[PDB]
C-alpha cells in the first residue's frame, strides 16, 4: 500500500458507512446501492456482506472492506457489472463520463466535493486527454 491508496480506501469506506460508526450494515449497503440505481433484496445484501464478513458479526469493518478490495483486484468484477457501473455515470448515454456526470453521481452518494476536486478525479482517469472518461478508460480504472 501507498499513503494515498490508504486515503483513497478510507474515503471509499466513509461513503458506505453513512452514520460513520465504523461498520457498514446491510441497511447502509442497501441505501448506497439504491442511490446508484440498483435494487438488491435483503438476502442479496446479506450475501454480499457475508462474502467478506470475517468475524461473523454481520457487518463490515475497515479491514474486511480492504480484504474485499484485494479480492476483486485479484478476480475482477464481471464485464456486465462494469458495464452497469459505466451506465450509472454516463447518464446521457453518449459513451463519455463528463465532470458534470461524475458530480451528479457523487451528489447522490452524499459526497461533498469542490468543482476542482471533481475535475481532478476526471483528469486522473482520463488517458487520451480529452477531459472525459470513455468506457476503455473506465474499465482500466475499475480493474486496478
Ligand atoms: C465514484 O463513485 C462511486 C460510486 C459507486 C461505487 S461502487 O463501489 O458501489 N460500484 C463499483 C462496481 O463494481 C458501483 C458503481 C456503479 C453502480 C453500481 C456499483 C456497485 N457494484 C456492483 C459494486 C458494489 C458491491 C459492493 C459490495 C459491498 C460493499 Cl461494502 C461495497 C460494494 C464506486 C464509486
Ligand atoms: C485511475 O483513475 C482514478 C483512480 C482513482 C481516483 S480517486 O477519486 O479514488 N482518487 C484517490 C486519491 O485520493 C483521486 C485521484 C486523483 C485526484 C483526486 C482523487 C480523489 N481523492 C482525493 C479523494 C478520494 C475520494 C473518493 C470518493 C469515492 C471513492 Cl469510491 C473513492 C475515493 C480517481 C481516478
Ligand atoms: C466489488 O466491491 C467494490 C467496492 C468498492 C468499489 S470502488 O469503485 O468504491 N473502489 C474503491 C475506491 O477507492 C475502487 C476499487 C478498485 C478500483 C477503483 C475503485 C474506484 N476508483 C478509485 C475510482 C472512483 C472515482 C471515480 C473517478 C472517475 C470516474 Cl469517471 C468515476 C469514479 C469497487 C468494488
Ligand atoms: Ca455504519
Ligand atoms: Ca464483520
Ligand atoms: Ca455522457
Ligand atoms: Ca478520455
Swiss-Prot record:
A GO biological process held by the record: regulation of cell communication by electrical coupling involved in cardiac conduction
Record PTM N6,N6,N6-trimethyllysine, positions in chain: 112
Residues with the Phosphoserine modification: 78, 98
Keywords, sorted A to Z: Acetylation, Calcium, Cell projection, Cilium, Cytoplasm, Cytoskeleton, Disease variant, Flagellum, Host-virus interaction, Isopeptide bond, Long QT syndrome, Metal-binding, Methylation, Phosphoprotein, Repeat, Ubl conjugation
Cross-link (Glycyl lysine isopeptide (Lys-Gly) (interchain with G-Cter in ubiquitin)), chain numbering: 18
Necessary and sufficient for interaction with PCP4: annotated segments: 73-144
Residues noted as binding Ca(2+) 2 in the record, renumbered to the chain: 53, 55, 57, 59, 64
UniProt binding sites for Ca(2+) 3: 90, 92, 94, 96, 101
Function (record text): Calmodulin acts as part of a calcium signal transduction pathway by mediating the control of a large number of enzymes, ion channels, aquaporins and other proteins through calcium-binding. Calcium-binding is required for the activation of calmodulin. Among the enzymes to be stimulated by the calmodulin-calcium complex are a number of protein kinases, such as myosin light-chain kinases and calmodulin-dependent protein kinase type II (CaMK2), and phosphatases. (Microbial infection) Required for Legionella pneumophila SidJ glutamylase activity.
Protein name (Swiss-Prot/TrEMBL): Calmodulin-1
Organism, scientific name: Homo sapiens
